[PDB]
Design a binder for this molecule. Structure first.
Ligand SMILES: Cc1ncc(C[n+]2csc(CCOP(=O)(O)OP(=O)(O)O)c2C)c(N)n1
Ligand SMILES: Cc1ncc(C[n+]2csc(CCOP(=O)(O)OP(=O)(O)O)c2C)c(N)n1
Ligand SMILES: [Mg+2]
Ligand SMILES: [Mg+2]
Ligand code: NA
Ligand code: NA
Ligand code: NA
Lengths: 555, 556
């Protein structure tokens, strides 16, 4: 009889099911309609439980977790606007490959389209953004537990990447408990004390080994390093070296950047020339950062364009004739090995070295370009780097040479300035590692309430808020000068000292290299967050990037 | 010739079509793909432009501005997750009626599903929630200007309520010297440019016809329920119900003056529900009923007819009575359906109502949130407005307080999200330019904390009361499980707002008693600025006080 009882039983099946697909972290916001789920989640010791109050921030907390752990991560929110707040993180996951399990509680059908409080149309909400969507029915004994678990299983197990939306209607009552659904739960036999799914469906998606690799490696080819794992970046740096091919590695590639300041040199006739001679470009990973690289890539004309990543669909915004190959990068390289061939490029290496030389000559100024340049003086040892959006990711790319195999993380799929503080958190938590995060002032304002989560870290995390008073990328872009402060830049004339106090975070506003150094030396001493604020002249960053762009276009 | 110049006239037409549907305010966030729309929005002087860095907050600003002005309000965002951050406000629009028109910039088709940065599938992302959606094609001269403005005029002319999604693809280049490429293209509309009118006028009226059996129905023993409506409508509903001598069950969102206050306590006494059992008809004006006992009574009553009269569409009766659903401007309907003077039929309820109120008054003294809820009418700004937050505050004020007639009350009680409250309030004050009282709980203030930025520009004093019971104490009102309540429900954040207030240069007070609270109330009404007032309370005293009071009154 007890509708309470059953409800908690139906939710219990749901949350154990995900025990079977590697779900370790579950992130939770409060709600009422959510109780069946949250309880079930709370009572299951297979999980590490996180909570936050801002469902959008929650979503990015899961995102961060998933991004580092490479595990599916489950989220529970209540019905209503709460669910919609998950959209951003979902969109990004749908683009970058994070597996997010979204369990969104709902009113029963009796209560849809009839003026009931907090009652929205929720199935289909995220349209084509989730990889799989599940519209669960009105919980009843008449549908066996085996159906419920078989559906969840198919969803999770055939999940190459992106998230999964599972909608979970619950009618009232929701608080009560009885035996009511016990015999129904036990129809699942010893599955309850098992390790595995009820239904095992986990076929692999992989592109066959390319039979003409041996032909193609003998030609003048270029390697492009996209977003990939720390370790894939090492394996790739080595692979290109051996092949003799010039490596143009993005900031997110953790390849070592053997030809640094690419955003610069790629802007020089002598470089484009040499590169014109290539016949095959093999790009590994995607979401390329630099402006000049995207243009080079747009207009480059090799006989064939290869792109290799374990994410599905097209990744060439330019639509070259060629191939799109789905694989684990490290797995793909083993399968397409390199043979010792001799470097064919001779003028690019000069140009790279000269372009870095141009940059260090400009290093003394206490600005954001200078910070980005000098960033690997600051990387916490055995740690990880979370890079913001806007100017920051573009600066470090253009100006800094990151070590091979140092892990970098970032939200570069859709590039939102909306989840960054909270993504950084879930990144810090997933790996246990000291973390450095850099973000601009509008991005830290966006997600300012994530300063709450940053009270619970498992190793030091330093948040650098580069404060140039507004969205200054819109001073790098040729935005109509007259409208640009009010409708582009939006300076908020703010600081972050009180924001840090509120969440009892340690704060520094260093005013030169000496004091920012002391800041760090205090930061890494304790398993807490410290807000560091660099206040800089609004356009110094972008101007300087521009001048170096011209400098390097000229030699 | 120049692509970037055609893009500008393509946008300029779009923003000029808005101009002829009453669109006055337009809320804008930064962006680059949005640039043509933002240029055309800012070049076009028919608008008042509002800007904000947070697109969910921007969304909620637009919502507020619309909530007050009753005009459609425009938003401009760039492509990506910026678009997705408008969902909250859109869905709330979907329920309470605000016309928000969302101009969402986009990459052109080529750059979709190809690994392009900041490029997501934008058409349809909001599903059924917007009222209509336009999926505008790739800008070209081969599509007559007269097409773009007809399609918008249809969109806006036929919008009875809720949101509009206009997706705007634009292809690089987006910057250049403004040639005069699409000019003769623009000139194809002709003097329309100098008119004030829609190109196509399509604005057919949706309304329910006159209830020809009203003279019969108005003579029976009815009940009048008053939900969300306009302040003016409140007054009107209060007269009309006292005329028919029916008992008025007014919601806090009803603005009737609640002649039977504390309905949430007296509806729990077995004597009231017994009397009401006599009702042959219930005429409910407006929707989103507030308290639990009125919801429980609504679901349980069994008149021969139930009527919901409101100017939004669809069913509004979550209990699905036999009866009628009646779409119209409430006042208009009062005029079409006049009251006849008849004898009050209710003997018991009016006695309990004054007995409920007395019982609350007995407890007015303690410095907690139940008390604040009760006293509030003593603190309303002269000729100003009330923005009432979600969770406890709405329910306590509903339960424990009696607000005056026709005092404007605003809130987000459609989906009841605590995700956009401050940012909504700002928009709510900007729309009318009235002194404003927004009350909001601690998690609700963390959720929109960056909206503090927006509450640095107010035309008129606005007080922000933050009630800090260290958590979501509505989860102490509900029978949640004692074991996991604290970390999985209440989520106490252990925080204050002194510094948040300092951060945005907003005056702060943490009053400890009634003397201090009213002091802070006074100096606050003397400047067109926000003064934040944080009331720190013992977490469960609010919940309990209500609980107890529900119990005392169920025994009277
Ligand atoms: C959700 C969302 N809103 C808006 C944008 C557009 N956008 C890109 S960069 C940027 C500027 C961010 O400013 P700041 O945080 O200071 O970084 P800075 O530009 O100074 O480098 C904006 C608003 C976006 N990418 N995502
Ligand atoms: C966007 C959104 N997320 C979650 C909820 C569910 N919810 C309702 S009340 C509440 C707690 C609000 O806490 P607080 O702001 O401190 O007010 P109080 O409960 O103390 O009245 C939550 C999380 C909601 N209605 N909307
Ligand atoms: Mg900035
Ligand atoms: Mg609270
Ligand atoms: Na896993
Ligand atoms: Na299998
Ligand atoms: Na004070």
């Amino acid at each position: 009889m007890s509708v309470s009882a059953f409800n908690r039983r139906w939710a219990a099946v749901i949350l154990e099911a995900l025990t079977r697909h590697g779900v370790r972290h579950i992130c939770i916001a409060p709600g009422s309609r959510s109780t069946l789920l949250t309880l079930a989640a709370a009572e299951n010791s297979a999980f590490i439980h996180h909570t936050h109050f801002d469902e959008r921030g929650l979503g990015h907390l899961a995102l961060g977790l998933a991004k580092v752990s490479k595990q599916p991560v489950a989220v529970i929110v209540t019905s209503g606007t709460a669910v919609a707040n998950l959209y951003p993180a979902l969109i990004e996951a749908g683009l970058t490959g994070e597996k997010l399990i979204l369990l969104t509680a709902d009113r029963p059908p009796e209560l849809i389209d009839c003026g009931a409080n907090q009652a929205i149309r929720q199935p289909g909400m995220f349209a084509s953004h989730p990889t799989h969507s599940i519209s669960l029915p009105r919980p009843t004994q008449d549908i066996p537990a085996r159906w419920l678990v078989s559906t969840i299983d198919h969803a999770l197990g055939t999940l190459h990447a992106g998230g999964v939306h599972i909608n979970c209607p619950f009618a009232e009552p929701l608080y009560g408990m009885d035996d009511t659904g016990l015999s129904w739960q036990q129809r699942l036999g010893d599955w309850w004390q098992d390790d595995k799914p009820w239904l095992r469906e986990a076929p692999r998606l992989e592109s066959e080994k390319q039979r003409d690799w041996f032909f193609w490696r003998q030609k003048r080819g270029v390697v492009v390093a996209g977003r990939m794992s720390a370790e894939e970046g090492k394996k790739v740096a080595l692979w290109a070296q051996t092949l003799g091919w010039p490596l143009i590695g993005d900031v997110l590639s953790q390849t070592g950047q053997p030809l640094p300041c690419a955003d610069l040199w790629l802007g020089n006739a002598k470089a484009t020339s040499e590169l014109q001679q290539a016949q095959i470009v093999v790009q590994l990973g995607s979401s390329l950062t630099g402006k000049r690289l995207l243009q080079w890539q747009a207009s480059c004309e090799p006989e064939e364009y290869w792109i290799v990543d374990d994410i599905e669909g097209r990744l060439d915004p330019a639509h070259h004739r060629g191939r799109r190959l789905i694989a684990n990068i490290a797995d793909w390289l083993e399968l397409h090995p390199a043979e010792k061939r001799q470097p064919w490029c001779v003028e690019i290496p000069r140009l790279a070295e000269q372009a870095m030389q141009a940059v260090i000559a400009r290093r003394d100024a206490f600005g954001e370009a200078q910070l980005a340049h000098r960033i690997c003086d600051y990387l916490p040892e055995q740690g990880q780097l979370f890079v913001g959006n806007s100017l920051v990711v573009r600066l470090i790319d253009a100006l800094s040479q990151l070590p091979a195999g140092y892990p970098v993380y970032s939200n570069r799929g859709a590039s939102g300035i909306d989840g960054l503080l909270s993504t950084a958190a879930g990144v810090q938590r997933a790996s246990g590692k000291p973390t450095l995060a850099i973000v601009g002032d509008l991005s830290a304002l966006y997600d300012l309430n994530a300063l709450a989560l940053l009270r619970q870290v498992s190793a030091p995390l330093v948040l650098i808020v580069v404060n140039n008073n507004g969205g200054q990328i819109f001073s790098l872009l040729p935005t109509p000068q007259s409208e640009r402060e009010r409708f582009y830049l939006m300076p908020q004339n703010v600081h972050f000292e009180h924001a840090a106090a509120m969440f009892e975070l340690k704060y520094h506003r260093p005013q030169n290299w000496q004091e920012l150094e002391t800041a760090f030396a205090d930061a890494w001493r304790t398993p807490t967050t410290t807000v560091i604020e660099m206040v800089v002249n609004d356009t110094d960053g972008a101007q300087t990037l521009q001048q170096l762009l011209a400098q390097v276009s000229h030699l």
